[PDB]
RNA sequence: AUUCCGGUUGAUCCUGCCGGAGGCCACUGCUAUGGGGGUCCGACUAAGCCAUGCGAGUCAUGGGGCGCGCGCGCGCACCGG
């Protein structure tokens, strides 16, 4: 379809982009757990073509900030945006501009560059299935004054959390969760970053080879 | 649904309080077709005052006796329980 449409008019600037364009890197999971740097959004546009669909591109927050000069007030726009494959890959970005379209575009680019993969499972006392509809164990996240704690829930319990957390977890591929919070949750940037870090910290919990089949743990895409 | 949103600045992050948004009880405005079930209706102020009528009686196989009809049968009150 549009693979030859996105790959033909792109000239790589970095070495990872060249590796991807030649064809030696072929799956999304081969770019993560090395010390690789990602400085091109076309890498992710090639390896995850689904992040380009407009239904996977939630725009979260738009703010208008002012800088004083003796002439007048200089206005700037700040846009916090979210991107994600709905099967375990998420990204969060912030973009500034002298107008709104420039800021939105820069936010989506920086969201594509900040892509992470997460782990999923069941882990609940009340469901005990082995299907990756939630997170497999409770996790913590912090940002500024905001603290977030996520806990696994049973099937059909849909996303008991604020709306920013709702959208981020929906772009993550998670469907059931309980939550607790502390701090200035009315500041959208800090709440969003704390939930992002909570989702990241699923990779920081040590597990034994017997837990992967008890909780149905899946790393990245499922099936 | 183990949930958040608005408000102190030229703009920002915090603390902290006020408000919204849910449910139950009492008074109340506008409006109102029909059935069923139920442990609903002068409790909050004055456990303030009350006109009238009803809310506790029964036994004639405990006793004597009066009346009405043919010793018997019906009825009334009295003593007694
Ligand atoms: Zn489950």
Within 7 Å: CB of A188 and strand B?
A: yes
- Nearest nt to the CA of A187 via C1' is B13
Q: How many Å is the maximal CA-CA distance in chain A?
A: 67
* Chain B positions with any atom < 7 A from a protein CB: 1-6, 10-15
CB A135, CB A126: distance < 8 Å: no
Q: Which of A164, A10, A43, A198 is nearest to A109 (CA)?
A: A43
Q: Which of A164, A159, A152 is nearest to A191 (CA)?
A: A164
3-state secondary structure of A217: coil
CA dihedral for A159, A205, A117, A212, sign (positive or negative): negative
Of chain A, the end-to-end C-alpha distance in Å amounts to: 24
Query: How are beta strands A218-219 and A119-120 bridged, if at all?
Result: antiparallel
Known binding residue A29? Answer is no
Residues 6+ apart with CB under 8 A from A182: A146, A147
Spell out a b/e string for A112-135, using b for 16 or more CB atoms within 10 Å of the CB, else e. bbbbbbbbbbbbbeebeeeebbbb
Cα A119 to ligand 1 centre (Å): 14
Q: Which of A156, A166, A210 is nearest to A188 (CA)?
A: A166
Block residue for tokens 């040590």: A206
- Nearest nt to the CA of A162 via C1' is B3
Count CB neighbours of A193 within 10 A.
Answer: 21
Cα(A198)–Cα(A206) distance, integer angstroms: 15
Question: In units of Å, what resolution does this entry have?
Answer: 3.0
Q: Which of A176, A166, A165, A121 is nearest to A141 (CA)?
A: A165
The C-alpha torsion from A40 through A144 and A177 to A107, rounded to 10°, is: -30
| The A89-97 sheet, strands edge to edge | A59-68, A73-85, A89-97, A115-117
Cα A154 to ligand 1 centre (Å): 5
Write the burial class of residue A35 (CB in 10 Å: 0-12 exposed, 13-18 middle, 19+ buried): exposed
Cα(A178)–Cα(A157) distance, integer angstroms: 9
Cα(A210)–Cα(A63) distance, integer angstroms: 47
């Amino acid at each position: 379809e549009i693979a030859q449409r996105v790959l033909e008019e792109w000239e790589p600037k970095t070495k990872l982009g060249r590796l991807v364009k030649e064809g030696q890197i072929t799956d999304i999971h081969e770019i993560f757990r090395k010390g690789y740097q990602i400085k091109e959004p076309e890498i992710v546009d090639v390896l995850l073509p689904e992040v380009n669909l407009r239904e996977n591109q939630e725009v979260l927050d738009i703010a208008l900030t002012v800088r004083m000069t003796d002439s007048g007030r200089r206005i700037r726009f700040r846009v916090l945006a979210a991107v994600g494959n709905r099967d375990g890959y998420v990204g969060l970005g912030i973009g500034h501009g002298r107008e709104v379209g420039i800021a939105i575009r820069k936010a989506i680019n920086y969201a594509k560059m900040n892509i992470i993969e997460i782990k999923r499972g069941c882990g609940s006392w009340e469901c005990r299935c082995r299907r990756p509809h939630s997170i497999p164990f409770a996790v913590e996240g912090k940002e500024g004054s905001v603290r977030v704690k996520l806990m696994p829930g049973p099937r059909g319990l849909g996303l008991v959390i604020g709306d920013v957390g709702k959208k981020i977890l929906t772009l993550a591929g998670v469907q059931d969760v309980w939550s607790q919070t502390l701090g200035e949750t009315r500041t959208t940037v800090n709440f969003a970053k704390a939930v992002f870090n909570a989702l990241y910290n699923t990779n920081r919990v040590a597990i034994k080879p017997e837990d992967i089949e008890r909780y149905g743990i899946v790393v990245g895409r499922a099936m």
